[PDB]
Amino acid sequence: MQGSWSVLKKNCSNFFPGLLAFAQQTQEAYGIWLRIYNRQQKYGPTDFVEQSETFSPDYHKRFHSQDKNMWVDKELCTEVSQKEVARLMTYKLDMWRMAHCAGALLATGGYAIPFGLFWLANDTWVPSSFNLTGEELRAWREAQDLYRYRSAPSYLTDTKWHFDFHAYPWNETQERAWDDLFEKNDVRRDPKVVRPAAEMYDGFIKFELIRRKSLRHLCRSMNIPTFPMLARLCNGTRVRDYWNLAWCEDYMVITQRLHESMTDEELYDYAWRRYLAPYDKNLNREQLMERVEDYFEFLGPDFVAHGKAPNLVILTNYVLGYYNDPAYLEGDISELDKNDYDHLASWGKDAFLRRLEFENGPLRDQVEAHTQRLLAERAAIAK
């Protein structure tokens, strides 16, 4: 979304109430995170707690391993509720953007004020706490959805093009899964059909091998600030933390069937945090439930059985495929009755163009026959 004066007024008016709300949310989220962190350190696997190192096979660069460096706490419901996890995720997003802004302020002193004016004029990078009414929150969510729409197609195209240019699927089922994974959101993708793409891509690029440019696209699509990007293991850490929390909440919901009892607005928020349900689509409860159930089915039985989710790259592509709208087409078909090169009509045809029309026109066969006969006669005379 572009900056506007109305949004600037909105954010300037709600600046200090927003900061106070952010501070209160910071205290609450620190409590929630402290509970989760203590539980992770106490009951987590040895590899997860010790932060086992996984290096790439080409340049031996460390990155998070989905199997070892991510852990789904199946018994987190005892200590932390689903709503608390959602609160922590939302606060993590807000805190990341606030932290980048605070870093800019500290770095540049008082010269960041005009950039702050640019910042408050847009809802893309302001915290959710700056909205004190429903309409303001709706506009803020619209800005977030617009940024997701702007960023997701590049991520999807990067993944698809690199794989298709450097590799191909092994079998027909993988071919169908790969082709159906990147369909536009106007058609419904069957998660059972699309799941094999996860293993196929695990053969190609696991989350531990994700490239820095692809990571930048993904973080843009997830509303995660990317400047300064720095090493890929910083925003990668952010992505890992966010999706680890999401998977913990998903296990809680699947096991306890909370989504069925979840209300309409809370269900919409739950889908939105999974990048499944844009607010501009005006989805009803039926559509939200369908998308959430498809997401759970994509996670698969192994997620509940062992807490192992499919490949994170393919999962992110699948969920962000809901922001891959059909390419726009505006204008009546009658516009195809016009002409594009009327401005050249005055120039006419030169000698070469006339020759080409004569040789390749409706009389082309006659000209070809005459030319070949003449050449044959000349060749015979020469011999």
């Binding site: 500290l106 770095a107 540049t108 002193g109 008082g110 010269y111």
Partner: protein, 85 residues
């Protein structure tokens, strides 16, 4: 000689001259003007980026104790090898 003279830029328009002292001083004045305000604390990365490297280089110049002679950078004639002055 004459063939060698063909290999020169053909669209020279204007040449301007400025002493190193003068524009260095002007740049320092600009830097002081922009780094002076109170709302830019001395501990900010911007201020240190502006000042620390320059201070370090000037200190290195001052500490220099060379046994050889370095001819003045901006002499009128630096083409004579047997005349450093």
């Amino acid at each position: 000689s004459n063939p060698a003279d063909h290999f020169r830029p053909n669209l020279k328009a204007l040449t301007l001259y400025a002493e190193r002292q003068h524009y260095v001083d002007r740049w320092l004045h600009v830097k002081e003007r922009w780094l002076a305000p109170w709302y830019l604390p001395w501990w900010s990365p911007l201020f240190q980026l502006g000042t620390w490297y320059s201070q370090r280089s000037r200190n290195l110049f001052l500490v220099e104790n060379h046994l050889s002679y370095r001819p003045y950078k901006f002499r009128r004639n630096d083409e004579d090898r047997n005349n450093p002055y």
